[PDB]
Amino acid sequence: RLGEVEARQVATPREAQQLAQRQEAPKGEGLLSRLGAALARPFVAIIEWLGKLLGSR
Amino acid sequence: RLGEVEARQVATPREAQQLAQRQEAPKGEGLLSRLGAALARPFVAIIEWLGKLLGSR
Amino acid sequence: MNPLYRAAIHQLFLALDLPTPNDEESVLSLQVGPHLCHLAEHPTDHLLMFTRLEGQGDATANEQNLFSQDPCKPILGRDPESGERLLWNRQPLQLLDRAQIHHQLEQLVAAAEELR
Amino acid sequence: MNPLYRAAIHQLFLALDLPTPNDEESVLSLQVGPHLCHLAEHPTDHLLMFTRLEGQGDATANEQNLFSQDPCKPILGRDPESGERLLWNRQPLQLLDRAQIHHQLEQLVAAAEELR
Amino acid sequence: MNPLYRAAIHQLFLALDLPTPNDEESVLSLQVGPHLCHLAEHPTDHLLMFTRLEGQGDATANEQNLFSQDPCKPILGRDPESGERLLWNRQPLQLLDRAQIHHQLEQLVAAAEELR
Amino acid sequence: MNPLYRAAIHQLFLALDLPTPNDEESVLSLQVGPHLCHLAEHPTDHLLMFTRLEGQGDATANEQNLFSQDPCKPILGRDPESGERLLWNRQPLQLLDRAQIHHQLEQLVAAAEELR
Numbered sequence: 001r002l003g004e005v006e007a008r009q010v011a012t013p014r015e016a017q018q019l020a021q022r023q024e025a026p027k028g029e030g031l032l033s034r035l036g037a038a039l040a041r042p043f044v045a046i047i048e049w050l051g052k053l054l055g056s057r
Numbered sequence: 058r059l060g061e062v063e064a065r066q067v068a069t070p071r072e073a074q075q076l077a078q079r080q081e082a083p084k085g086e087g088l089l090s091r092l093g094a095a096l097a098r099p100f101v102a103i104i105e106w107l108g109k110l111l112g113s114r
Numbered sequence: 115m116n117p118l119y120r121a122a123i124h125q126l127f128l129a130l131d132l133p134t135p136n137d138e139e140s141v142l143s144l145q146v147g148p149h150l151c152h153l154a155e156h157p158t159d160h161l162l163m164f165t166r167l168e169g170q171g172d173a174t175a176n177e178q179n180l181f182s183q184d185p186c187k188p189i190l191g192r193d194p195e196s197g198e199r200l201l202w203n204r205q206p207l208q209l210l211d212r213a214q215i216h217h218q219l220e221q222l223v224a225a226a227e228e229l230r
Numbered sequence: 231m232n233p234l235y236r237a238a239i240h241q242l243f244l245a246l247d248l249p250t251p252n253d254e255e256s257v258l259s260l261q262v263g264p265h266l267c268h269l270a271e272h273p274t275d276h277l278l279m280f281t282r283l284e285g286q287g288d289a290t291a292n293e294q295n296l297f298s299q300d301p302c303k304p305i306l307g308r309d310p311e312s313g314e315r316l317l318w319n320r321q322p323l324q325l326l327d328r329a330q331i332h333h334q335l336e337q338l339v340a341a342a343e344e345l346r
Numbered sequence: 347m348n349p350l351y352r353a354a355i356h357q358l359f360l361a362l363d364l365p366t367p368n369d370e371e372s373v374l375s376l377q378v379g380p381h382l383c384h385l386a387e388h389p390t391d392h393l394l395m396f397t398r399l400e401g402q403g404d405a406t407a408n409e410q411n412l413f414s415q416d417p418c419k420p421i422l423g424r425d426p427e428s429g430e431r432l433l434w435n436r437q438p439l440q441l442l443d444r445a446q447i448h449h450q451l452e453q454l455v456a457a458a459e460e461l462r
Numbered sequence: 463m464n465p466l467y468r469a470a471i472h473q474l475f476l477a478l479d480l481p482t483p484n485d486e487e488s489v490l491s492l493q494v495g496p497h498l499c500h501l502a503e504h505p506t507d508h509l510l511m512f513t514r515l516e517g518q519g520d521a522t523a524n525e526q527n528l529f530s531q532d533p534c535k536p537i538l539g540r541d542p543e544s545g546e547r548l549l550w551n552r553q554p555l556q557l558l559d560r561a562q563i564h565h566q567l568e569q570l571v572a573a574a575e576e577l578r
Contacts, residue, residue: 020502028456035379045102077154085340092263098400179307191295412539423528
């Protein structure tokens with residue numbers, strides 16, 4: 001789209017400085033091995049819905 | 058009263074009398090308790106396909 | 115010979131304008147054209163009807179095995195031993211009258227006519 | 231909805247330790263392990279349960295579509311419109327108490343477990 | 347089929363101990379426990395993974411949609427057409443190895459498990 | 463300071479006709495009209511940009527947080543310690559041309575203008 005950004009550099013506040021390095025504890029590690037995986041052959045309706053979703057976006 | 062299906066009583070073959078009483082061993086004893094049951098809210102695509110199927114077939 | 119099944123046989127043979135059988139044979143047979151249809155009580159208080167078709171394969175079978183608005187729509191399977199095609203429907207005797215028994219028979223016969 | 235159908239569904243949900251939904255659009259869906267099962271009133275005064283299958287097996291001609299002594303033994307059919315393979319049983323509403331509707335669902339799920 | 351996406355899918359199915367599928371309208375679906383996940387190339391040179399939820403609860407401006415140090419942290423959006431809630435993550439293909447694809451899928455499944 | 467992040471920052475500031483900043487601030491800021499946009503490397507080799515919306519609404523996050531063709535489409539989350547809405551996007555820093563960095567900033571500012 002429109003590629004003309006009217007910007008000036010300003011000082012970074014401490015709150016944004018801390019937000020830009022925010023961390024979250026590692027979640028659900030080892031879960032793929034606990035649950036296991038298998039190839040799925042879902043509903044024809046689900047296949048069509050996947051196609052319609054990926055084509056609309 | 059009369060008409061429609063034209064038919065006549067005939068003898069029954071013994072193979073047919075054997076087929077008419079065939080049995081299978083009971084299956085799935087306690088299966089619902091082992092697998093468990095929960096109400097499902099499937100894809101709206103699944104629900105629409107179910108509506109089409111139960112309305113047309 | 116359970117009473118409900120005997121009454122069902124009597125009402126069906128009245129709908130077919132046939133004399134009601136007098137010997138309590140458990141499984142009865144009616145010849146509707148080339149269709150040898152068999153009636154039985156299987157299980158108790160359930161009227162089962164089934165006929166045998168010629169051939170083994172069928173490209174219009176699994177669609178016949180889909181439910182429809184009519185519970186009397188016959189199921190198409192095969193003989194356990196051997197591989198003969200088989201058409202069968204079943205109704206609960208405790209909820210039937212003469213007309214619905216006749217409907218079960220005519221549905222079995224119509225399906226035997228359509229297949230394959 | 232049909233009060234008979236609602237009472238039957240309520241008995242089933244009592245048999246499953248599940249809260250009964252208040253007037254849900256006919257077709258309900260239950261997750262029984264990996265099996266997505268669907269209940270509906272189809273036709274009127276009848277309860278139809280069915281689950282969709284993926285690929286393994288033969289829906290054209292199989293032992294599954296042969297009648298046994300259990301009317302709740304499901305049929306393996308195929309929707310010709312969508313091509314989806316379905317496993318379905320059906321029981322009349324006026325023939326269903328808690329035990330019988332639980333048995334219907336359990337037989338459906340057992341036949342689903344048999345075909346992987 | 348983009349060879350990068352082909353190799354990425356192959357590495358993923360190797361990390362999951364599964365036979366690698368072929369190039370055949372490759373919008374793949376994997377059953378990770380009770381979670382149906384979908385893999386696609388969207389956009390070009392980007393591996394996208396996503397799973398559909400059933401809830402309509404606390405899906406707007408959640409902590410899930412806040413960035414973390416993990417680029418594979420899934421985002422929870424909603425399809426305006428089907429109304430479905432989708433949990434998704436994405437990674438550029440040209441920088442992927444087996445460990446990162448495994449990590450992407452694992453974070454997707456973890457967030458899907460912790461959102462019921 | 464990572465040469466990838468410093469090079470991307472240099473290219474972005476050249477694209478904005480601004481002097482390239484020094485290696486002091488790890489997190490930089492740009493006042494694009496009413497939007498205070500913060501640039502950072504989080505994680506390593508990932509250019510993250512985010513702006514804190516001064517409060518516009520909560521129901522706009524569902525469709526906004528759904529993936530699209532552009533990986534730079536901003537995500538609308540919420541800081542669980544403040545409650546204020548945060549718009550943010552992120553790109554891997556490897557081989558980012560000037561146009562792509564400027565496009566990420568464009569997307570962030572445009573979505574901050576739109577929502578709600």
